[PDB]
Every structure is written in structure tokens, then in C-alpha cells.
């Protein structure tokens, strides 16, 4: 139930201007990445609650349950958005219920909980600018001296994860430039932690199998996690996964929890987007670009039965325990928007 069936575009553009503004920046990739999508999402919803007129909570539920369905229609693949929404919905119904009970002291109006919801929203914001700090701590309970680590594609969360341990313990790391998309960032990361005193070895995205023979652990930072524990990761990460499984090398994932979403991977072909082929073939080979089929996937998928351990802003947990976070973080009704 999108918002267009509840409010008109002009009204949406008038009362909730930043929404349509964000919707524009969403489908146009003006905003991008999971983190930047999340923070901007809540900031929008903050103003929404800060500038809305309503009475019942049930009608307030129907509103946010509508913009999200529209907001998620923009660029659904960046699930980071919808995850923030369903969090708010439960954050309302349980805040309502917890306040529906104090009023039932002995009475046997019902709104303007505004600033609390805002104060509840800000609690989500301040929680995000922190996941790295909350995650980079559990490193010292896994990475040890002289260990050998493999990791692909400039995941910021993974960067501060290792750099923390590298402050005190000294060890080695192999970095595979997540070609083609994560090329630039990956080299920077390698250059960065190189200064952090950790043996860094940049490789082609293809020499994965060659070195997996003598690799202790492998570490990955995803783009999103789906209801079955599957991972929607950036380009070219199933190789290292399958390379690890073939070598009995364990697979660990260091990701914030906001990237977790209960959407179920019915059809992956509707998930893995495709970017421009410019990233892999120049415009110049005019003969080729006219004679062949060029494709450049942005994301990669790995199934959960290949992950051995997750690293979250809450703690380390096996994939089979992931669901019990969702029910403790989301509500079942808000699976489909």
C-alpha cells in the first residue's frame, strides 16, 4: 500500500518534501551504500514525525507503513532503508503498548508521543555512528599474531576491525581488489593498513585459490543479509567463499546489524543489480561492444551454509541464531511493505 493511495504527489511533495527529494536521490543513486541510505532514511522520517498531524496510532501506523512501501519501491536492493522502517514500526507498537499499560493503572489523549519517537529515532542514529567501534573490539578474540587473513573489497567495517588488532598484535593480511567496482577503495585500504604495521599483500581478484592453501581465516564485510542468512555482498565475493569451503578455511562476516533484513531471496535475478559495462570494457572497442554481450554485476550472493561466524555490533553469533535477532529487532508484519 504505497502513499500515492493515501496522499497525492503534490501533498507528499508539500507536507513531506524531503521524502520525494530523497526518493529522487534514491532511484538516481545520488545517495548510495547501505549506511548512507540508513542515516538519511531516519533523518527523513524524523522530520516526517516532526511535521505531521494525526490522532490515533493505528492511522499513524498506516502512514509509515505506506511511505516505506513507496520508499522501498525506489531502490529496494538497498535494504538498509526498509530495515530502518520496520524497526520504527515495532519501536512504535511496543512503545505504544508500554504506554497503553501505564494508563491502564486504574482508569478502567492518546497521541503527542512525538518527541519520544524522535528521541527514540535519535537513539537509532547515535547507535549507528558506533557500529565500527562496537565491532572493532571483538577482533582481539580471533586475530592472533602471525595469522594470515584474506579479505576482498574495501569494507570499512572490516578495515577498523583489523586496524584495531594491528595496534598491539602483528600479523599478515591478503587483500584481493574487488574488481571492478571495489578497485579504488580496496587499494586505499591496503595502503592504509600498510601504515598500521600489518603485512599487506594486494593480489589480483583471481589468485584467490592459489593462496587459500596457506590462509588461516577469511574475513568479509557484506552489503546486506537476507532472511535466510544469505549474504548480499559486493562484486566477486562468492569466489573467496567457495575457495574457502574447498579448503576447510573458516568464513567470518563483520557487519553491522542494520544491513540485516528479513526479505526472502525468492529470486536472486531480481536482486543482483547490473552497473555499466564501462567499468570492465572501454567504450573504444566499438567492434566488440557491438558484437558481444557485456555485463557488470554490482553485488554478489553467497548462501548462509557457507558462513561460519557473524560479527555484529551486538556480538558474535552463528547464522542459525540470526532469526532471533530479527524478532527482537523487527516485527513479522513489517516483512512485506
Amino acid at each position: 500500500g504505497p502513499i500515492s493511495e493515501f496522499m497525492s504527489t503534490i501533498n507528499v511533495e508539500h507536507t513531506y518534501p524531503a521524502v520525494s527529494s530523497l526518493i529522487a536521490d534514491l532511484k538516481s543513486r545520488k545517495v548510495q551504500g547501505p549506511f548512507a541510505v540508513a542515516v538519511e532514511t531516519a533523518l527523513v522520517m524524523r522530520q516526517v514525525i516532526s511535521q505531521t498531524r494525526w490522532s490515533t496510532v493505528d492511522q499513524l501506523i498506516d502512514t509509515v507503513r505506506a511511505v516505506g512501501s513507496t520508499l522501498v519501491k525506489a531502490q529496494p536492493t538497498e535494504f538498509s532503508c526498509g530495515n530502518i522502517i520496520r524497526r520504527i514500526l515495532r519501536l512504535i507498537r511496543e512503545e505504544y503498548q508500554e504506554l497503553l499499560k501505564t494508563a491502564d493503572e486504574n482508569e478502567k489523549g492518546g497521541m503527542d508521543m512525538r518527541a519520544v519517537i524522535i528521541s527514540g529515532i535519535q537513539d537509532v542514529i547515535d547507535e549507528l555512528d558506533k557500529i565500527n567501534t562496537d565491532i572493532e573490539v571483538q577482533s582481539m578474540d580471533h586475530l592472533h599474531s602471525n595469522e594470515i587473513i584474506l579479505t576482498q573489497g574495501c569494507s570499512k567495517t572490516v578495515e577498523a576491525f583489523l586496524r584495531f588488532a594491528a595496534k598491539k598484535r602483528k600479523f599478515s593480511v591478503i587483500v584481493a581488489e574487488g574488481f571492478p567496482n571495489n578497485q579504488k577503495g580496496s587499494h586505499a585500504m591496503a595502503k592504509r593498513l600498510a601504515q598500521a604495521g600489518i603485512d599487506t599483500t594486494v593480489i589480483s581478484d583471481a589468485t584467490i585459490f592459489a593462496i587459500m592453501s596457506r590462509v588461516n581465516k577469511v574475513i568479509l564485510g557484506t552489503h546486506a543479509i537476507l532472511g535466510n542468512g544469505g549474504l548480499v555482498t559486493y562484486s566477486g565475493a562468492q569466489l573467496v567463499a567457495q575457495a574457502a569451503r574447498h579448503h576447510a578455511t573458516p568464513v567470518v562476516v563483520c557487519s553491522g546489524i542494520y544491513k540485516l533484513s528479513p526479505v526472502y531471496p525468492y529470486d536472486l535475478e531480481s536482486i543482483i543489480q547490473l552497473s555499466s559495462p564501462d567499468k570492465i570494457m572501454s567504450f573504444n572497442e566499438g567492434d566488440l561492444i557491438s558484437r558481444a554481450e557485456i555485463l557488470n554485476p554490482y553485488y554478489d550472493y553467497i548462501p548462509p551454509d557457507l558462513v561460519d561466524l557473524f560479527i555484529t555490533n551486538l556480538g558474535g553469533y552463528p547464522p542459525s541464531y540470526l532469526y532471533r535477532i530479527m524478532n527482537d529487532t523487527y516485527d513479522a508484519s513489517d516483512t512485506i511493505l
Binding site: 601504515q195 592459489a210 593462496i211 592453501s213 562468492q238
Partner: protein
Amino acid sequence: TDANLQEKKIFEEKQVSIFSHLDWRRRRTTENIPKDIHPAVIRLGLKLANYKIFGSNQRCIDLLKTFKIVIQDYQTPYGTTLSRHLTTHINSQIAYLVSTRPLSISMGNAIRFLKLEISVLDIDLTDDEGKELLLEKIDSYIRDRIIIAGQVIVQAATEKIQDGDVILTYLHSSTVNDVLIHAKNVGKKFRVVVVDSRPEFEGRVCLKLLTEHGIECTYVMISALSYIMQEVTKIFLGGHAMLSNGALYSRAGTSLISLLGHESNVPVIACCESYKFTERIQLDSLVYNELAPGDQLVNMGVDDFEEKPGVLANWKSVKNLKLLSLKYDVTPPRLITVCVCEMGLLPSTSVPAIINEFKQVYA
């Protein structure tokens, strides 16, 4: 070479780094070359270090065609017959060539073969008698061992191609291209997938060839293998060598192809030639291998020659930071379904017996 205390220096190159033993020393210029070096050998030595796409077969050919010129231009120091002294001359040619690029398996086996025929040569002949002989033996080698074997493999290879297939190759194998073009010329209805990878995108030239024959081709880098394999139904690989255990030894990205193929239930077909079999074996892709300079991936972007720099141009002088790129990796045999030698379609594990068929019933 100060001496072979520089080889003691190699004995010191066994340190913590897994690649400590891998030889990095090269000579990509003719500075201070020795006197006893044939010109047509120099050109080859230059062609080795600077050419890309240098197919493992053509090198063996271009080596032999060059070797004939050496012997044809060779004259023994009279009073000492040919067979007693020819090897050291040639032995002084290899030692130069290896300093431009380590010997492929396709070349080393030929070397060990010719050195044999030198020893077994009948002394009761003369120079012009002797040298003319092995030239035919060399030519016979090229006829039987590679070209015909090549011509047999392709025919047997395209035989198992079925109309409606979807073929996947990776990084320009002259043999693999040679069979693909044959498939179109017999009216086989299919299409090809071309996987490429960094650095020197050897797969583009495979796309160039196949396109210039008009084939529905598809070009995606290897970091998209998870995606494209669903469309694929068969996989063809041309190998640098096949190991006596049955493992396939080819370019760095060969393994993931076979791996992802298995976990997607597609077959892996190793079109390799008998003379590229080796008695040796490898458990890790690191013990026996050869490298390429890490600078070649500093260039981020879609080009290689073009002066598009990067963020790693100082990696040589940034400690705890090193770039590398192995050129080859093994591939466990349980992922290879079939090997296509001129002895027919064989299971990869049957390799070492075939080598014995050469050692036995011959000399």
C-alpha cells in the same frame, strides 16, 4: 652472477613469506649479454619477456624453429666431434633464455628430448650428416607432437559439443580458440562465454578472434562467475600442463572456473597436449610457479599500456606492503571431468601412464 654464492643467496630466500622461494630475477634487456649467444635466440629472449598472450604451444614451436638455426649455423671445434660439444653450446643458450622468462613445461620437455637425441646420435656420421637428421626429428616433433595432436584434439573436442550449448572459456587458449572456430565452421549451433581477469586482460583477444568469426559471445570479468555460470552448460580449458596426479596447471584463474563449475554441475574439459605432461606433482599452487611484476596491476582502470597511474606506485618503498600476481595455479583433478589428449578423451588421472608409454616402448 657474481658466482653461485648468489645461489646461496637463493638459499637465504627461504623466509617467512610464502613466495620467498619464488624466483623474481629476470633480464629483460640485452645489457652485457655474453658472446656465445645466437642472434635469432636473442630475438626470442626479447619476445619472451615482452610479449603477452604468448601461447604455450607457439613458444615451443618458435623455440624449435629457432633451435634449428642455431645448429645449422653451428660448427663444431674440429678435432672434437659434434656430439661431444653441441650440448654445452645449447646449454649456454637456455641459461640465457631462462633469464628472460622461466621455461614453460611445453618447452622443458622438448629440451629434455633434444638433449637425449644428441647423446644417442650415431658417431659414425659427420656434421652435415648429423645436423640435417635431427632437423627432421625436430620437424617430426612439431608435426606429430603438437600440430597433429592439435588437429586431433579439436576434432574430438567439437565432437562432444551439442547444438544449443553455451561454452565458457577464459583467457585466450589458442587451442581452445582453435576448437571454437572449428565448431562454427561445421554449423554447430551454440554460443560462447568469455571470462577475463586482471591484469593483462588476456581474454579480450579471445573475444576479438571469436567475434571476427561471428559468434554470440559474452564478456564478463571473473568476479562475476557466480552470476554467469547459470547460463553456462559446458566449460573448456586449455592448460599449460597436466600433473601426473591428474591436476590441471594453467593460468591463475583456472581453478575458480572449475570450482564454480562443479558447484554448478557443469563439466570441465581440459584440452591439453601429451607433450605438456609432467612426471612431477603439486599439492599447493605455490611450490612450483612463476610470477609477473606487481607493477602491472598498479594501473587501475580498463587499460594496461595507458599511463593511468594508481595509489600504489610507491609500494616498492612502502614497508609491510607488497603487490604480487602469480601466473599459474593448479586445479585438483576431482574438478576436471575429462582431459582431451591426442590419445583421445581420458580421465585426468590417467596422465602418468601416458608418459610411461613414451618412456617405455621407446628407447
